[PDB]
Paper text:
The structure of the [name] N-terminal REC domain (BfpRN) was solved using X-ray crystallography. The structure was refined to 1.80 Å resolution with a crystallographic Rwork of 0.1824 and Rfree of 0.2019. The BfpRN construct used for crystallization was composed of residues Met1 to Ala129 with three additional N-terminal residues remaining after cleavage of the affinity tag. Only residues Asn4 through Lys124 could be traced into the electron density. As expected from our sequence homology observations, the structure shares the canonical OmpR/PhoP receiver domain with an alternating α/β-fold consisting of 5-helices and 5-strands (Bourret, 2010). The asymmetric unit of [name] contains one monomer with an adjacent symmetry mate forming the biologically relevant dimer. The dimer α4-β5-α5 interface of [name] contains major salt bridges between Lys92 and Glu112, Asp102 and Arg116, and Asp101 and Arg123. The [name] active site contains the canonical conserved aspartate residues, including the phosphorylation site at Asp55. A calcium ion is coordinated into the position of the active site magnesium. Alignment of active site residues of [name] to BfmR bound to a phosphomimic results in an RMS of 0.290 Å.
In summary, we conclude that Francisella [name] is a response regulator of the OmpR/PhoP family that negatively regulates the expression of some FPI proteins and biofilm formation and positively regulates resistance to AMPs. Response regulators are transcription factors composed of two domains, a receiver (REC) domain which is connected to a DNA-binding domain through a flexible linker. On a molecular level, the response regulator propagates the signal by accepting the phosphate onto a conserved aspartate located within the REC domain. Alignments of FTN_452 to other bacterial response regulators suggest that [name] is a member of the OmpR/PhoP family.
Residue numbers in the entry:
A (entry chain A), B (entry chain A): 4 to 34, 36 to 125
Write the structure that this text describes.
Amino acid sequence: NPKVLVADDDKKIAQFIKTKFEENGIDTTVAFDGKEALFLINTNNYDVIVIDWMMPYLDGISLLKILRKQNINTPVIILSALDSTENKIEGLKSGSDDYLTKPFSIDELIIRVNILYKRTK
Amino acid sequence: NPKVLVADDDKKIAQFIKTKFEENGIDTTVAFDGKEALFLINTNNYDVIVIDWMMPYLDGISLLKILRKQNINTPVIILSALDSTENKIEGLKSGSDDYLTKPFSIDELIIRVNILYKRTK
Ligand SMILES: [Ca+2]
Ligand SMILES: [Ca+2]
Ligand SMILES: [Cl-]
Ligand SMILES: [Cl-]
Ligand code: NA
Ligand code: NA
Ligand code: NA
Ligand code: NA
């Protein structure tokens, strides 16, 4: 099973994602803000990381930039309310492997998680 | 009259702000994205600058950081949908003189424009 971290402060959305991921073959840990996410990412191995764009302590893009500075190169998917092409490009340049605008498709998110897991062996 | 630039890509909100400002004694120029705002700020003198948090080409915080790097110290008010205290603090540390969460009060915005104009003689 892919091992994935999901970081969002919206507990309903986080629970929804976790339920759908574990329905499929994806073992999922939830972090409810950027501080907990940073800690978990630095003390556990994940195959893919799914990060919401806005949470307490560290927003998603800021956490991603910290990770890439730390030479943590785990595949990252950003979930963001900033839906312009310019903001998608900024998220990708910041080091994300994909960038899904909200409202997002859970089916697409699961497929992209699996694609990234397959690519990173 | 205070001379003020208002930057937002939402034309209805920009027009509303301009109407209320000019009703009061505030001469107002509108810029509809961050590129036009940057150009106008570098080619005109303004007493106060009101910047929306998200627009094409340059978001409000990024424009503010560019301005403060350029040693342009004109008072800036940020209008933002990011309403947590943490995000307000980040906006202030980025160089803004005030930070109003949306939905904002036009009456408060006018009063704060006038306070900043009075303080900068
Ligand atoms: Ca969130
Ligand atoms: Ca806007
Ligand atoms: Cl956007
Ligand atoms: Cl917020
Ligand atoms: Na499981
Ligand atoms: Na932040
Ligand atoms: Na006028
Ligand atoms: Na930006």
